[PDB]
Ligand binder design. Sequence first.
Ligand code: 9IO
Length: 292
Amino acid sequence: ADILPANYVVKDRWKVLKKIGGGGFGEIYEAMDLLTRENVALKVESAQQPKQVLKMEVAVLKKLQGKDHVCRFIGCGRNEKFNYVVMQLQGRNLADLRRSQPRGTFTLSTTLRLGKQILESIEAIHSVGFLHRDIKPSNFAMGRLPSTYRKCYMLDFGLARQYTNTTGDVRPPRNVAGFRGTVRYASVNAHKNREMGRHDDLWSLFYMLVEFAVGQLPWRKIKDKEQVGMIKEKYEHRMLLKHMPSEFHLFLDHIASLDYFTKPDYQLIMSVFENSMKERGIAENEAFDWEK
Ligand SMILES: COc1ccc(Nc2ncnc3[nH]ccc23)cc1
């Protein structure tokens, strides 16, 4: 049922080595670039499959070229059987790296430094007029080169949505928008099927960094979407910060104050991370938990 067989060659250039991921919206392959001789990421979707995401992914990936924390764009194409995008291959995703930790926790050093990079990548996609809407650990990975192994990349844009027109004006929100992302990291606004805003990506970041440093979220073992939403709407989020740096109260307070229309203060949130490293002599050049 795989779209491309192993050893299949795309545009006489990209040779499929293996499927490395998959899900109801298309597949991702590791391929060899027969010209440049490096391995690459190859995302494919059926020409027929009713929801066409790669048109989204490619448009966002091209807009973001020249930013840190995004994959170099290599190529894209259509034909009778599938569409495809070729981009830079990255290393281990943050969900695998977290799971691999003894306590399923990152140190605060690793946590805070990932927060700075992920926040940059969130400000970057917002700056070109798109919401991510699916901020989660498996949507980031570390590099796999001497030049990148300490850099964190935003991998996928398949749920993204333009929140501007051509002019930089915020589009009108729909009265109802069926939330589509991952349950664990979704904001209360998404659970309520409200139009998501820039702040909803920052809610997802907030939940991810808590889960990083503390190893779990209170709703971890609930898979039912409505249940998770009802738990989150009640839950005293200062309890999440019990065992986090207190500067995170500023992060929480700020994003809780935002609405769909309001531009977040990203420098406020960048400050929270940097100050938190400062008060603790965490260095920008320290080993990540998974090295040594
Ligand atoms: C096992 O779960 C996975 C999560 C993420 C990805 N994605 C990518 N992996 C590497 N390099 C990549 N460039 C662009 C996307 C991409 C693959 C598998």
